[PDB]
Write a protein that binds this ligand. Structure first.
Ligand SMILES: Cc1cc2nc3c(=O)[nH]c(=O)nc-3n(C[C@H](O)[C@H](O)[C@H](O)COP(=O)(O)O)c2cc1C
Ligand code: SF4
Lengths: 71, 430
């Protein structure tokens, strides 16, 4: 019998029987961010191109100086 | 309006046994007066007089005695046919047949003769309950006196009717009061009632056509025949008419058995001949109007209810054996009905499932609810179990066990509510 299995010390009616199952805590959990957030905070395209070009120019100048010293 | 019988209109003039109950007393009081003429008059004449006298079965069923007698076969077949007289009263509260057999046995014997003549019965068997042994001895002595005087035997009277009356005693069983169970017990088997495709008027005591009739009806048969059916129909009202002896017992001041006109108010019956409730009318709580079979009634209904077949049936109850058991405010009606359920569980024969098991279940539930160890849905389940037991059982003892619980649920439900709530509070506190 359901009442026999779920008997309460001081209950009178079959209703308000004790119950405790897995479920949300009071408040219903928290949002979980189903969407995606990909930030693009890397260097700009013009910045890296200018860096590469300046690096190439200064490196060729250094190559010239080193070749002069070796000569 | 109804009631207040005079000593001349009372049928059982030796109810308390203040005079000689034997043959000499019987002749002095007016027994065996014109039995020869009554037998000579005719079986059909006797049946017609019973039919137009308004007499109804006094064993509880209330079926018309005249029609019940006319149900017998008119043409004498090979089978001898039988009369049986139900002296086996075991329903709680009623003791009228005890007094009838003990103090007016010659009236019972003359009634057996008259009923056998009117139903073309070869022989009669009086089934006394095993508990009644002094009454059985008195009836044996009366039967021997009648046989010696020639009132019974090959020549019952100047008429040529052949009639033999024997008495057989039970061994303490309440189911044996039922007609088919009584026939089975008289056959020498267990007191287990039969079903009802074969009616007892077709295949009864030994397979022969027999008729089972109550002691009170069979005993009042000669008196109403001698005094006229109109005289009997004068008392009472409508269909249910005549003189019925009520046993008033319980918490009344002076419990007593008294013969009174039919359709007397219950209050008037209690507070005129018996004496009244122990602490006045206001002290009265609940009255069971018939035996323990019929449902009880609260104080409110008993103020104006009439002690007869119809008014007690107009309310959800029945007259039954018309033995009122009163209960005042001092007692607990829940415990009273629990004891009644225990009695029915004890006295069920246990051949058919709804009564063999259901009566025990009802007793256990009533015992639980007496203390209060139950639930609201459990009293609802108790009512449902009552309904399940009632209509699906072999005999009327299932109804007799179901009815008191149903009446208690119908009327005294708040008492059960209070008991259950109090026990729940006590359990929570503990
Ligand atoms: C549980 C139960 C108890 C009975 N008790 C009695 C009883 O005490 N006396 C009796 O005459 N019949 C008793 N009977 C049988 C019926 O009252 C039956 O109708 C009766 O024997 C014949 O009806 P009558 O009143 O027309 O004579 C009982 C039946 C049952 C089912
Ligand atoms: S109702 Fe069934 S169990 Fe009850 S006494 Fe009758 S036959 Fe037996």
């Amino acid at each position: 019998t359901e009442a026999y299995i779920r008997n309460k010390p001081g209950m009178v009616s079959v209703k308000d029987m004790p119950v405790l199952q897995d479920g949300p805590p009071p408040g219903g959990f928290a949002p979980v961010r189903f969407a995606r957030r990909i930030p693009n905070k890397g260097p700009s395209a013009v910045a890296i191109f200018l860096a590469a070009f300046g690096t190439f120019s200064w490196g060729m100048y250094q190559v010239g100086q080193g070749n002069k010293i070796r000569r | 309006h109804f009631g207040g019988l005079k000593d001349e209109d009372r049928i059982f003039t030796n109810l308390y046994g203040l005079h000689d109950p034997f043959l000499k007393g019987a002749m002095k009081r007016g027994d065996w007066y014109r039995t020869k003429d009554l037998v000579i008059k005719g079986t059909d004449w006797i049946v017609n007089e019973m039919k137009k006298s308004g007499l109804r079965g006094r064993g509880g069923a209330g079926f018309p005695s005249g029609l019940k007698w006319s149900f017998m076969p008119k043409v004498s077949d090979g089978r001898p046919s039988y009369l049986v007289v139900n002296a086996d009263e075991s329903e709680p509260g009623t003791c009228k047949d005890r007094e009838i057999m003990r103090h007016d046995p010659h009236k019972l014997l003359e009634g057996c003769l008259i009923a056998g003549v009117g139903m073309r019965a070869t022989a009669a068997y009086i089934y006394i309950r095993g508990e009644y042994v002094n009454e059985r001895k008195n009836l044996e002595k009366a039967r021997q006196e009648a046989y010696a005087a020639g009132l019974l035997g090959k020549n019952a009277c100047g008429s040529g009717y052949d009639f033999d009356v024997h008495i057989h005693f039970g061994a303490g069983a309440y189911i044996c009061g039922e007609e088919t169970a009584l026939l089975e017990s008289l056959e020498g088997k267990q007191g287990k009632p039969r079903l009802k495709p074969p009616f007892p008027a077709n295949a009864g005591l030994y397979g022969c056509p027999t008729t089972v009739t109550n002691v009170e009806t069979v005993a009042v048969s000669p008196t109403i025949l001698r005094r006229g059916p109109e005289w009997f129909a004068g008392f009472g009202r409508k269909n249910n008419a005549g003189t019925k002896l009520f046993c008033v017992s319980g918490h009344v001041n002076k419990p007593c058995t008294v013969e009174e006109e039919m359709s007397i108010p219950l209050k008037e019956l209690i507070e005129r001949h018996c004496g009244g409730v122990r602490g006045g009318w206001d002290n009265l709580l609940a009255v069971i109007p018939g035996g323990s079979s019929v449902p009880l009634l609260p104080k409110s209904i008993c103020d104006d209810v009439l002690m007869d077949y119809d008014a007690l049936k107009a309310v959800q109850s029945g007259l039954g054996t018309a033995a009122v058991i009163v209960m005042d405010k001092s007692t607990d009606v829940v415990d009273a009905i629990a004891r009644l359920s225990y009695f029915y569980k004890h006295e069920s024969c246990g051949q058919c499932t709804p009564c063999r098991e259901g009566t025990g279940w009802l007793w256990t539930i009533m015992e639980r609810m007496k203390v209060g160890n139950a639930k609201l849905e459990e009293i609802d389940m108790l009512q449902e179990l009552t309904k399940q037991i009632e209509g699906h059982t072999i005999c009327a003892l299932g109804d007799a066990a179901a009815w008191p619980v149903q009446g208690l649920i119908r009327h005294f439900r708040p008492e059960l509510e209070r008991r259950i709530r109090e026990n729940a509070e006590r359990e929570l506190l503990q």
